[PDB]
Amino acid sequence: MLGFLSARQTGLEDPLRLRRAESTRRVLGLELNKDRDVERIHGGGINTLDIEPVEGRYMLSGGSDGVIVLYDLENSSRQSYYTCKAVCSIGRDHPDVHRYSVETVQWYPHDTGMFTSSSFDKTLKVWDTNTLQTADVFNFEETVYSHHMSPVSTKHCLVAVGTRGPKVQLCDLKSGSCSHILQGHRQEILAVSWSPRYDYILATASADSRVKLWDVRRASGCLITLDQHNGKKSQAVESANTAHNGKVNGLCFTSDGLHLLTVGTDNRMRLWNSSNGENTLVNYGKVCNNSKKGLKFTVSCGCSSEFVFVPYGSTIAVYTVYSGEQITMLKGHYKTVDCCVFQSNFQELYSGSRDCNILAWVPSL
Amino acid sequence: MSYNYVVTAQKPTAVNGCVTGHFTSAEDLNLLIAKNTRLEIYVVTAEGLRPVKEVGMYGKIAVMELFRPKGESKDLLFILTAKYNACILEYKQSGESIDIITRAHGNVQDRIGRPSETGIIGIIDPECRMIGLRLYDGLFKVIPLDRDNKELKAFNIRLEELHVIDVKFLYGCQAPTICFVYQDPQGRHVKTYEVSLREKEFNKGPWKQENVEAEASMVIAVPEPFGGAIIIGQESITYHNGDKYLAIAPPIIKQSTIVCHNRVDPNGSRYLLGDMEGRLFMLLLEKTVTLKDLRVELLGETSIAECLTYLDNGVVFVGSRLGDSQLVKLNSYVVAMETFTNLGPIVDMCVVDLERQGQGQLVTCSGAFKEGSLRIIRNGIGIHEHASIDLPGIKGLWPLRSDPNRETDDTLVLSFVGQTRVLMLNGEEVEETELMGFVDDQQTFFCGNVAHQQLIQITSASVRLVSQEPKALVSEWKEPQAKNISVASCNSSQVVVAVGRALYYLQIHPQELRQISHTEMEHEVACLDITPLGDSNGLSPLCAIGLWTDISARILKLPSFELLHKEMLGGEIIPRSILMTTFESSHYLLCALGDGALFYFGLNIETGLLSDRKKVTLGTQPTVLRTFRSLSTTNVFACSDRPTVIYSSNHKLVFSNVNLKEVNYMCPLNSDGYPDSLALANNSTLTIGTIDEIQKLHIRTVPLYESPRKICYQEVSQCFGVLSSRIEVQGTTALRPSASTQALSSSVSSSKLFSEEVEVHNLLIIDQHTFEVLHAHQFLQNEYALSLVSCKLGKDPNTYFIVGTAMVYPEEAEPKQGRIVVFQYSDGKLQTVAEKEVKGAVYSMVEFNGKLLASINSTVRLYEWTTEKELRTECNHYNNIMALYLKTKGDFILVGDLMRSVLLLAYKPMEGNFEEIARDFNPNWMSAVEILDDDNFLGAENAFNLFVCQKDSTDEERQHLQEVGLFHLGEFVNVFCHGSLVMPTQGSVLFGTVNGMIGLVTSLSESWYNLLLDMQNRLNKVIKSVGKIEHSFWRSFHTERKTEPATGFIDGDLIESFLDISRPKMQEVVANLQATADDLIKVVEELTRIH
C-alpha cells in the first residue's frame, strides 16, 4: 500500500493507472461483506438485480414472486455496519403487480426516473420510479425470458425482448409500436443484451444452441452466428453454426464491448470475438450451468484485469475474462445462485439467489 | 463560498517530453519542450538556446512528435492531450507577430475501452503514411495521412495482444509496420504486423515473433542501414531484424531500469540511454550492410532523465520530472553547462511567516532521491540592467556631483584593496578618471557632498576637506600622532572619524575642519552613523555606534559623548553596519550584524532609550546598510547574500526581497542617463539598474541528495522538521552520501517495542536561516516517517516534533505496526519525549483544540497528552476505507479517503466522541484535502480534478454533502495549505503539485462569479487556442466514471490572458456584458495582486 502512495505522490507511475492497478488488487481479496445486509422482501429466489448506471446508489431486484423491490444501498448510520433498505417495492397490493416470476428488471439507460420489468406473465412494463405508477404495458404470446436496452446512447428507444418464441421482439418505447421483429432463431430465446460499444448492435441467445448479433437497422438477416469450432468442423446444415453443445442461456459483453461471453447448458463459458465471432478458445473449464431459464452474470470494469462473475451452483465463480484463470468461488449462499451484479464504484458485488436472500460482497483490508 | 477562483502561482517546471527537429524554419534546429500544460520552442545556437515561443495548451501533453510529409516545406508537429485531443500544428510567423497554426485536429477518445497500463503511446511513420495510437488495450487507433485528414478521422484496428509494453514504427518497410513487445503468460515477446489502410487491418509482419526478457521494457527503431529493432531490458539488450539475433548483457546496466533513450547519430550508430540512477549511457552499433555488434559506454551522471534529445556538438538537453532539468556537455565524465530549476514532484510544503511580516513564504519538499531538495519560493524584485561593467572587488560606492551648479550627480567613487578609483559617468558612458582633492592612492572610507559648497573624501590616511568650486584641499584632519582612520561615517556637515578605541569628532565649517571632542571607548570602535535625523538645521544631536569585545550598540549624545543606552546584543557575532532613518514619522534604528541578523529599535531623539526590539535575519554574510530615496520616502538597501530592500508603509515595517544572488554595496544614484537609479556591486561586476515595479518570484534551491517527504515549521526553535528517506542497498551502505549523513549531531532511534535495497528514514532539524542540518535522527529498521507535527500539546507548553511511522516488511503489503513519537529540539539537542505503539501506519497528524488527531490506517483517532508525559486516546472512529488526509477547523474535521471522497467528521465535547456530521457519496480517489471555511471544502481528485462540497440545510438527509464546484486543473495536487505571497477575493489557499505547478485558490461572491463567467466564454470566442481545443472541455470534470462542465470555478489564467491579447479584440469581449473597457483592465491587474 505504501509504495503505491509514494509512487503516486512523486508522479513515478501514472495515477489513474495505479487506480486501475489498485482496483484489481481489491477484486482479488473480495469477500462476503458480513457487516452489510440486503433487506429481505422477495418471497421468491432472486432472478435479477440492477444497480443504477449513474452514481449507482439505488438498486432494483426481481423475484419469482412477481415483485419488483427497489433498494437504497448507501449508509448514513453513524455505524460502519448497515442494512440496505428498500425505498419502494411493487408488492402484491399494487394495481399493476407482476402476476408471475420477474426475470429481468433494468434501469432505463440515461434516465433514472424510469425503469422496466418483464416476467413470466408475458408482459413488459414501464415504470415511473418517482410516483411508482405505470407508464406502458406490453403483452406477448409467450413467457418473457430476457429484456434489455443499449447503454450506449439514446438514438434509439428499442427494447430487446427474448420470449419463448423463436422470433426476437424489439419494442419501441417511443410510441406503442412493438411491430418490429427479428427472425432466424428456432427455439426459445433465453438471453438478450446490447453492445455497450455499438449503438445498434444486439446479441441474442436462444435455446437452439446458437447465438446471433443483429444490426437492428437492418430489415433482414443477422450479422454473424457464433460458431464454436471456428469452421474447422465439416458439419451438415442446421447443425453447423452452434455456439454451445446445448441450449445457450447466458450473455454478457466485455467492458469495452470487444468480446462476448456465452455460457450454455453444456457447462461451458466461451469468450467470443464480438466482431468476427472468433472463438478465442479461452478455457474457463467446466462451468456448471443446468438452469432451465436465463443465467444472469456480470463483468468487472475500471480494473487492469477484467474479471467475469458467473453464478456457479451455490457460489459465484470468479474468472479472468482473458486469462480464463479462476480466482475463487464467492461462497455465502446455501442455495443455487441465480444472478450476480458488479458495482464499479467500490468494486463490489451483489448476488441474488434462490435462498431468497441478496448478499453483498466487498473486498477485504 | 459557493463560487471559487483558480489561478497559477507557478507554472509546471518538469519536463515529461522533449523533441528536436527543424520546427521554426528548414535550418533552425529547434528544441521543443513539453511541460504538462505548456509547450516551449527554442533555437539551437552554438552558444546557449534562443527562446522563440512558450505556449499554453488546454490539456496535458501526452504525445509530441515532429514529422514532415512529402510536399510540405518544414516539419509539422503532432500533439495529443490526455483527454485525447489530437492536433497537427504548423508554425508560421510574419515579422514579429508570432503565430502557431492548426492544420488539423480531432479528439480520438473512444468513449470506452480499457486504457492501457503503460499509458498513451503516439508513434509516427518514417515515411509519414499514418499516425498510430496505442491508447486502449486490444485497440490500435490509426490516424491516416495520405489525404486531407483535417478532422483527424481515424479508425481502430483490433489488437489481438492486449498487454503491450511499447510499440514503434520501423524503417525501410514497404508498408507501415509496427514493432511491439507484448505480454501473454509466456513472458514478454516481440512481434510485427504490417499495417494496411484499405483492408483497415493488420496483416503479417516481415519476421516472426521471438522470445525476449521478462522485463524487456523498450523498443528502439533502428534506421535504414542495418535495420531491425533494439530492445532494452533490465538484464540484457537484444537486437532483432529478421535474419539476425544479437544479445548482450553488460554488468553495468543490471543495477537500474533504463527508462529513456534517443538517437544521436541519424544513421542509428550512437544512442543515448538513461536510467533512474541518473546514469547516461552510450549505445553504439557496429557496421550488403548489416549490424556487427552492440556496445555500451558509461558516459557520466545526470539529473534523472525522463526525456533526452542530443542537440549538436556533444550538447544534450535533459528532461526530468524528478529534479532540476539540465543541459549537459559530453566530454569519462559529463559537464552540465546549464541547469533549469524544476520544482520536482512537490511532495509537501509549508507557508512560513518569517520576518513576522504581512507576507508569508513557501518551503517545499521538492524532488525525490538524488535530486531531492527543499525549495524556497517567495515574492521579490529584480533590476532593469543598463550597465554591468566588470570591476572585481569594489569595497565601496559613493555618489557625488562634480559641478556645484548642477542638481544632477556626475561622479561615482569606488573603494579598493588599498587605493580609490574615480568614475566620471559621461552622461550615458561610464569612464575612469582623476579628481583633485581626492586621492587615488589611499583607500576611501567615506565621501560625498557637504555644506558651504564643499566636498569630502575620508580615506584610511586622513580626513581631507576639499573646496568643490576650485578643487584642491582647504583642510585636512589626521590623528595628532599620525595614524589611520577606523570606521568612517559622515553626512553633510559633521564627521566622527573613529580610531582604534578612541573617537575624534569633527565639523565641516567653511574652509576649516573643526574638532570639539575626543574620547576613549570601552572597546575598539565597530560601526558609526549620524544621518540627518530631525535635521532642524542639518545636524545631529546623537551618535550611533557598536563595539567589539562586548557586542554593544551605543547611542550617545553628540557634543558631550555620554552614554544614554548601552545596548547589549549578546553573542560572539559582532555588529557590522548601523544607520538612523525616519519612516512614516517614527524614529527607527537598524543595526546589521556580521551574520545578517538585524535589530530594529524604537527611538526618540530627546531620550535615546531604545524601546521594542526585534531580530529579522535577512541574510548570512555581513550586512552593510544604505539609505536610498525611493520617490516620496527613503528606503534601506541592505547588503548580504540574501539582499533586501527595506521601507515602511503604515507604521509597521516591510522587508522586500531583491532578486539578486548577492549585492555587496550600494548607493542611490540619480544621474541623467540614469535618473534615480541604483549603483550595485558584487564580487565580480558593478551593476546599474532601476527598481522593477513588477514583483516576480524568487526561488532558492537547497540540495538534499535524498527524498524529502514532510515539512513543518517550529517558531520557537526557529527551524524546520523534515522527513527524509534515503535508499541503501544490502549491514547496508548508502550509494551517495545525503544530508542525513552530513549532520552535525546525529542519533539513531532506540525503541525495542517492535519485536535487496531498503529505505532509511531520518527526521531532519534544519535551521531556518543557515539551512544546515543541525540534527538527523535515524528511525528504526524499516520505519517509515509518514506524518509530521510542529506544535505544543496538553497543558505542557513545550513544543514538539511528532512523527507517525510504520513497520515495513516484504511479506505484508499493508502495515499492521507503527508508532507515534514525540521529539523535542531545544538547547541544540534532540530530546525524545514519548512513544506510542499502534496497529498500523499513521498517514496523517494534526493538532486539534489541544489534542493530537491522527489517522492510524482505517481509523481516525484522537489523542490527549497526559501530564504523565504520554499519549491517551479520547475517542476513535472505525468507519473508513483508508484515512489519508486530515485538515481541521474548530471542532469540525475533514477526512479524505483513498476512494470515499470526503467526510466532514465532527466533534461534540460534552461526551467527547466522533459524530459523523456530513459525507460525500461521490466515489473519489483523493490526493489532497482542505477547508476554506466551515461551509465549503476543496479536495483533489486522483484524476487531476478539483471539486468543492457544501453542507446542505431540512431533515436527517442533511448528511449528504452537496457538490457546488467542478474543475479540471490538469495538475495532480499533492498538498494544500493556507497563506499568501503578497502584502477582490476572500481567503488564500496554496497548492503544490507533482508537475511543480504551484497554485493559488480563493473564494468569490455571486456578483463576481457571473461577471467573470461570461467574460471567460467571451474570451474563448476571441481566443484561438493552440490545437483548436475548447476551454470548457479542458475544464470539464473528467474521469472514466463521469464528465461534466466547469461550474463553480473561474479560471484566473483565462482571465489573466486578457492583458496579453490585442487592443480592439478586448472591446469585442465587452460588446454587451452587464461595464466599459477600462473598468475591466484595472481589476484584472487588481487580481494579479493576489498571486
Author numbering:
A (entry chain B): 1 to 365
B (entry chain A): 1 to 287, 294 to 337, 345 to 743, 748 to 772, 784 to 981, 985 to 1014, 1023 to 1113, 1124 to 1140
The authors write:
CSA is a stable component of the DDB1- and RBX1-containing CRLCSA complex. In this complex, it directly associates with DDB16 and likely functions as the substrate receptor. Importantly, the interaction between CSA ΔN and TCP1 was substantially increased as compared to full-length CSA. These results show that interfering with the CSA–DDB1 interaction, either by depletion of DDB1 or deletion of the DDB1-interacting domain in CSA, strongly enhances the interaction between CSA and TRiC. Importantly, we observed 11 cross-links between CSA and TRiC subunits CCT3, CCT4, and CCT6 involving CSA residues Lys34, Lys85, Lys167, and Lys212. Although this does not provide information about specific residues that mediate the interaction, the location of these lysine residues in the outer regions of the β-propeller blades made up by the WD40 domain of CSA suggests that these regions are important for the interaction with TRiC. Since according to the 3D structure of CSA–DDB16 this platform of CSA is not directly involved in DDB1 binding, we expected that the combined eight mutations would leave the CRLCSA intact. To unravel the effect of such disease-causing point mutations on the CSA protein, we created GFP-tagged CSA constructs harboring patient mutations A160T, A205P, or D266G, which are found in WD40 repeats 3, 4, and 5, respectively. A160T and A205P have been predicted to interfere with the integrity of the overall fold, whereas D266G is expected to have mostly local effects.
